[PDB]
Assembly symmetry: D2
Homo-oligomer: 252 residues x 4
C-alpha cells in the first residue's frame, strides 16, 4: 500500500522512448492512469501499447516543451483526458556535446529551453492544477551533470544543474500546497546511450571503471525510483535528488 | 514485486523504539524475516510483538555495539536464527548535546563508538556473511548533522558525518560482492524527540519554520524509505543518503 | 607574491555598484589593470574613481549581457583597452522574487539571459582570448540559491544553480588551456540588500539567527575572496565555489 | 594587508614533512610566529630551519595527538612559547589502506584517534585559549574521502568525513567567540604520495585522467590556501572546506 499509486493520475513528458518510457510504464504498473507526450503522437505507439498492457488508461498528446503555451495547454489537456492530475514527470530533454568555444546562441537556446525552461513551465501548469485540488508529486530528471561537469556539455550541464535548483526552490515554495518536488539523476543508462559518441570502447571501459557496479542502467534501475518518489513512502522527501548511477558519485 | 522483500532476512540494530522499531516493522510488513537487537532482550517486547503481527519470524538478541566482539558474534547469531542474512540496518545511536569546551574523552568515546565504530564493525560482520553468499543491502542511519553542523553536537555530528563517509567507501568497495550500501538521514522525527531539549517551544517554532512541510516526521515517513533502499527498486542506488526531512535541506 | 595580481588584466561585468564594484576595486588594489562594465558608462563613475585611486588603469564600457553580440564585442574591446585579458569576473545579475504560479515567459527570460546565458557567452569570449594567449582565471558569482531553494526565487535559483554547473564543466574543459574557472556564492551582503523586501525586520532577525556570525557581509568580506581565486595561491583550485556567508550553509 | 598574518601566532600539528610542513612555512612567510609539532622534536629540524629562514620564531614540541592529555598540554605549551595562540592547523594524520573485511579494532582506533579524535581535542584546547582572548582561525585537513569513498580506505574516510562534520559544527558553535573554523581537502599531492601504493603507474595514469589539470599538487598549491583561510580576506568564510585538487571533484 505504501508504494501503491492506484487511482493517481500522471503526466510524463518526452515519453516515446528511453527513461521517460520506462518511468511512464512503471507508473502504470504501480496503478496510475498515465498521460504521455512527445513531439508527435505517432512516436508514442510503443509507450501507449506497453501502458495499456497494464489495463490502465493511456492518454497521448503532441507537445513541444519549448513552446511555453504548449507547456500549459497540453498539460491542461492531459488533466482533462485523465480527469485530474497529481503526478508530473519532467523527462523531456535535448542532449548535446559541443566544444564550448563553438556553442552559438541558437544551440544554447535549444538546449536550455528544452531541458530547463520547459520543465519549469510544465511544472507551473501541473502545479496550479494540483494546488487547486489536493496536491501531488513532481519528479524532475536531472543528470550527473547536476553534480559534476562534463567537458563540451556546458549548456546541458547548466540546464540540469539549474533544474536541481528548480527542484529545491519549488519544493520549498509548494510544500504548503501539498505538492512534493523531487528529482532523479540517472547515471549512464543503456537506453539513453544511443548517440554515436557512446560506442567508443575506450570511453566505455573508462566509464565502467568509475562505476562500482561495473554496469550501465537498465529500465528496471529507474522505473521503481520514480514510483517511489511519487508514493506515500516518500511523504517526507521533498527537494531531494536521488542519483541512480551504480555508485558513480559515491566512488573515487 | 519491485518493492517486495519476501524471503529476505534482515538485522536491525538498536530497534527497541523509535526509528529502528519503525524500520524493523516496515521490513517485516514488506515480507522480510527480521532480527532485532538492543541492550536488553526485554526492551524489544513491543518491537517483537509488532513484527510477529505480520506473521513473520522475529529473532531478538542482546547487543552492545560498543563491544566489537558483540558486533560480530551477535550478528552471526542473528544470521543463524534467521537461516541467513541479506539486509542490515545500522540504527543504533547515542544522541548528545554538550558544549564542545566541556566534552571529555569518555563522552567522545561513548558517542563515536556507539554511532560510528559500532556501525562499521556490524557492517563488516554482516558484509562477510553476505559476501560468502549472494550479497545484500546495508542501510546506515545518518542525520542532518551529516550535512550541517549543530552547535554542542560536535562528537555526534562527527559520528554521523563519518558514517556517511563509511557509506560511500563501503559502497565502492563492496559492489563487487553484490552488496549495496546506502543511508537515510532522518530530519526531526517525533519518535526520536524524547530528550527534554525538544519541548522548548521557541525551538520548536524556529525549527518548524525551517521545514517546508511544517511538521515533524512520523513512523510512516521513514519505514518505506528503508524498504525502498533494500528492494530491487533500488538496484542501481549505492553509496547514497536519502534525507527524510520535510524539505529542510532543500530550503533556505 | 602568491596573492599579487600585478600586471594581470581583468574584466568585471555589472560593476557599477555592490559586489561587482567591491571585486573590481579589490582587483585593482592587488595590482591588476581593470575593465568594468554596466548598462551605461555614466553609472561606472564611482567604480572608475575608486580604481584610479589605486594608480591603475580603468577601462569602462557599455554592455548588456543579454545581447550575445555585446558579450563578445565588448569583451574583445575590454581586451584591447587593457592590452590583453586574463581575469574575468561574471558578476552581472538580475535579482527577482515572484510567486512561481505568476512567472511569465518574459520574466523567466530576463532573469536567465542576464544571470546564466550572459555569463556563459562572456566566459566564451574571454576564454577564447585567454586560450590564444597563456590562460587565465574566471570567477562566477553564484548565490545561496546554488545550494538551497528560496521560495518565489525559482528562475533566479535556476540561473545561479546552472552557473555553478557551468563553473564545473568549463573548469573541466578549459584546464588544458591553463584557464581556471571557479565561483563565489555570496550570502547576504549589505551592499546587495537594496530591494524593499529586505527592511522587513522580522525577516532580518530570522535570517541573522541562521548566520553563525550574526552579521551581513561587507565589501571587505568578498573582495579578497575574488583576488584569492584569481591568484597563484589558487593554482590548484578549479571548478569550486567558495561561499562567503558567515557560516550559513554550514549551520543547522 | 588583507592576506597578511604579521603578529599572528600559529600552531601546526604533524608538521615534520609534507602538507603540514608546507602550511607551516607558508604561515611564517605570511608573517606569523609558528609552533610546529611531531612525534619527536628531531624530525622537525627541516621544518624549523625553513621557518627561521623567514626571520620569525619557531617553537617545536613533541606531541602524540592520540594522547588527549598531550592534545591539551602541548597546545598550551605552544601558546606559552609564542606568547599566545590565534591560528591552529590540524594536519596530523595516519593514512591507511586495508580491505574492510580485514580491519581489526586496533587499526580502526589508530586511524580514528589520530585523524578525527586528535583534531577535536587539539581544537578544543586551542579554541579555549582563543575564546579567552580575541578569537582566531582553525583549519582542518580533510581529504577527497570527505566527498567520495576510496575502497579499502574506510576508517580513513570515516575520519576525514567526520572531520568535515566537526568543521561545520565547531564553526557554528564558535563563531560567537570570534573563532572561524574551516578546512582544506587536499587532492593528490606529490609530497603526500610516499607510500609504495602510489608508484603503480597504471594507477597514476588513471588518477591523472580524472584530474583536469593533469598534475599532482606541489607545496605552492596548498600553502597559500591555508594562509588565505587564516587571513582577514576570509573573515566571512566559516564552516567551509576548500578542495585543492586540480579540478578532480568538479570533473566527470
Ligand atoms: Na565518482
Ligand atoms: Na535549509
Ligand atoms: Na544553514
Ligand atoms: Na570527478
Amino acid at each position: 500500500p505504501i508504494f501503491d499509486l492506484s487511482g493517481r493520475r500522471a503526466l510524463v513528458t518526452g515519453a516515446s522512448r528511453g527513461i521517460g518510457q520506462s518511468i511512464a510504464v512503471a507508473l502504470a504498473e504501480a496503478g496510475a492512469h498515465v498521460a504521455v507526450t512527445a513531439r508527435t503522437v505517432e512516436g508514442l505507439a510503443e509507450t501507449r501499447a506497453l501502458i495499456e498492457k497494464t489495463g490502465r488508461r493511456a492518454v497521448a498528446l503532441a507537445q513541444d516543451v519549448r513552446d511555453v503555451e504548449a507547456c500549459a495547454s497540453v498539460t491542461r489537456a492531459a488533466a482533462e483526458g485523465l480527469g485530474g492530475l497529481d503526478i508530473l514527470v519532467n523527462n523531456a530533454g535535448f542532449e548535446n556535446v559541443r566544444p564550448s568555444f563553438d556553442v552559438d546562441e541558437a544551440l544554447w537556446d535549444t538546449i536550455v529551453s528544452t531541458n530547463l525552461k520547459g520543465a519549469f513551465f510544465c511544472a507551473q501548469a501541473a502545479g496550479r492544477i494540483m494546488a487547486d485540488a489536493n496536491g501531488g508529486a513532481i519528479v524532475n530528471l536531472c543528470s550527473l551533470t547536476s553534480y559534476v561537469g562534463i567537458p563540451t556539455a556546458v549548456p546541458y550541464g547548466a540546464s540540469k544543474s539549474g533544474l536541481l535548483g528548480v527542484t529545491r526552490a519549488l519544493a520549498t515554495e509548494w510544500a504548503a500546497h501539498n505538492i512534493r518536488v523531487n528529482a532523479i539523476a540517472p547515471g549512464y543508462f543503456r537506453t539513453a546511450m544511443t548517440a554515436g559518441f557512446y560506442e567508443d570502447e575506450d570511453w566505455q571501459s573508462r566509464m565502467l571503471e568509475k562505476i562500482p557496479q561495473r554496469r550501465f542502467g537498465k529500465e528496471s534501475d529507474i522505473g521503481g525510483v520514480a514510483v517511489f518518489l511519487c508514493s506515500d513512502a516518500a511523504a517526507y522527501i521533498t527537494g531531494h535528488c536521488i542519483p541512480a548511477d551504480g555508485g558513480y558519485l559515491a566512488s573515487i
